[PDB]
Design a protein around this ligand. Structure first.
Ligand SMILES: *[C@H](O)[C@H](C[C@@H]1CCNC1=O)NC(=O)[C@H](CC(C)C)NC(=O)OCc1ccccc1
Ligand SMILES: *[C@H](O)[C@H](C[C@@H]1CCNC1=O)NC(=O)[C@H](CC(C)C)NC(=O)OCc1ccccc1
Lengths: 303, 303
């Protein structure tokens, strides 16, 4: 038993990270087959990052302006193109460690693992949730751009995130691997604001089931409620409304514990109105929404 | 002069539309080079559309189950793969009418042209705006899926939308050309709800400039306001808050008319609080948010 925020093993991705330098700007790239993907602002100097015209910037470069290193080995760039906010560099060597992979775009509320890298070298791995306002709460310093987010299904790596920027509030924003931003952001060094964030209700319920499976039962009661009565309370506290599809997704957890979803909603309703009164759930004094129902099933189905 | 909702000329796209049939299900496909892109629910029967398992459905098909027609010519399918919610069919013939093209994902508030098609045959063309809740207000009947949305920049067609479904409220939802949905929808025939829609403020201001350029000036006054004072009124009426970037985007229109952006906001503030009192602007009795500042510049800069 036990319940921990955990990331996928990063081995398959570590073999794909390279260092990309253009001028005095260095960041990370993702090397799959004979292509290196990286944020397009690698072609910027500092004066350029306030209002870059990327099309002008790119036409003034040639292949030999791009320094790509895979550890010690230097990769020869033989072509380059821009695809939305990512640069695609054709190199002369296919990465022999290329895993089975796909490019997917995730939805708010879903989780993924981030492999933080600096200078082409993996540094740490952690799980993030895509927030309803299309930001993530990461840990990123200068030089981290081009670090990627991913999930592992079967033997296949699904890449879903590439890191580009930090917003003034300390949260992080980036693109999918086709170069399209999550959220209404642009890759310019100007002050941008994210929308209001909300709490992911289906995730909170999944985490309350995890708590019950691990022996934290103090917040349960015999009450029940209806979807409508719950959703009217939820929207007062900035919680996402709950759909019938969410109830269905929680099925396996309701079956394993014998506690119906609408019963758990009544417990959540009480915690929202009364608070937790110095009590904790799974070691937290706050309601956690960072775990999907699938994350919970993966750690709790064996209990 | 004059101001009309207009679509891009559709010629370059008309040459790319084909008919795709699998079983008794027929819809449209987009034929670029030697690939035909179409919604993956073409592989569904009716019993399948309530809860399809697309991976199971696809493994039970072979290339010869797919009938692709380009007018009279039958195209031979020699491979197939699934990419998120789109099917990619490799055919034996490259489309000789393939334009210069790219796949882009648009943001809420942006506009694009829809070429509505049935049985691989273009039927009509109209402009749409992507709503803040990731739906579009289209006109689509059975058989329209696989119709595409696009913009024309220079000589290049930017495809941004492929049509998949109608929601219970009569609005429409679909994917980008990589198969990733706009909004939190799935390609299942179940009741799904879109989020609350809001009014796109920068677009309304652009349209008020269009009105002034065309001689509709009755709503102007000498007042001015600040961004903060405006945004506090705007959020009471379900308008998107206005950013400094929006003010900058309106620059060319403020210059052409000599009316500062914050001056126009004061006029908008008054129309929101007082209404229009049976008066019209550009032939409408409502405030229109379907035109971007770039749409307005394109029709009004010559005036
Ligand atoms: C790329 O490595 C870098 C990642 C930033 C650095 C601090 N934390 C991050 O996530 N990105 C940028 O510097 C980015 C480049 C623009 C052309 C998009 N700008 C950015 O994030 O500016 C805000 C900021 C910069 C430095 C420290 C804190 C915030
Ligand atoms: C594809 O041609 C079709 C387009 C619909 C038909 C009515 N207007 C449209 O935009 N799509 C579907 O039938 C779609 C298929 C699922 C597997 C995603 N389901 C759908 O839109 O169901 C709602 C609906 C169906 C028929 C009429 C009105 C609404």
């Amino acid at each position: 038993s036990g319940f921990r925020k955990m990331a996928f093993p990063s081995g398959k991705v570590e073999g794909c990270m390279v260092q990309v330098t253009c001028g005095t700007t260095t960041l990370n790239g993702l090397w799959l087959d004979d292509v290196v993907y990286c944020p397009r602002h690698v072609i910027c100097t500092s004066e350029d990052m306030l209002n870059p015209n990327y099309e002008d910037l790119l036409i003034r470069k040639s292949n030999h302006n791009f320094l790509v290193q895979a550890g010690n080995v230097q990769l020869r760039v033989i072509g380059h193109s821009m695809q939305n906010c990512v640069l695609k560099l054709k190199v002369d060597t296919a990465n022999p460690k290329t895993p089975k992979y796909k490019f997917v775009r995730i939805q708010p509320g879903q989780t993924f693992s981030v492999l933080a890298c600096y200078n082409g070298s993996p540094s740490g791995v952690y799980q993030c949730a895509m927030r309803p306002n299309f930001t993530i709460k990461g840990s990123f310093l200068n030089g981290s751009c081009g670090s990627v987010g991913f999930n592992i299904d079967y033997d296949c790596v699904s890449f879903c995130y590439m890191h580009h920027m930090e917003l003034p509030t300390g949260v992080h924003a980036g693109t999918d691997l086709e170069g399209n931003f999550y959220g209404p952001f642009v890759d310019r060094q100007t002050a941008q604001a994210a929308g209001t964030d909300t709490t992911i209700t289906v995730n909170v319920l999944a985490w309350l089931y995890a708590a019950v499976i691990n022996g934290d039962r103090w917040f349960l009661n015999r009450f029940t409620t209806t979807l409508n009565d719950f959703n009217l309370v939820a929207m007062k506290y900035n919680y996402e409304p709950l759909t019938q599809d969410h109830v269905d997704i929680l099925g396996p957890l309701s079956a394993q514990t014998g506690i119906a979803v609408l019963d758990m909603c009544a417990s959540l309703k009480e915690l929202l109105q009364n608070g937790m009164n110095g009590r904790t759930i799974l070691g937290s004094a706050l309601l956690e929404d960072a775990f999907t129902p699938f994350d919970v099933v993966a750690q709790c189905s064996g209990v």
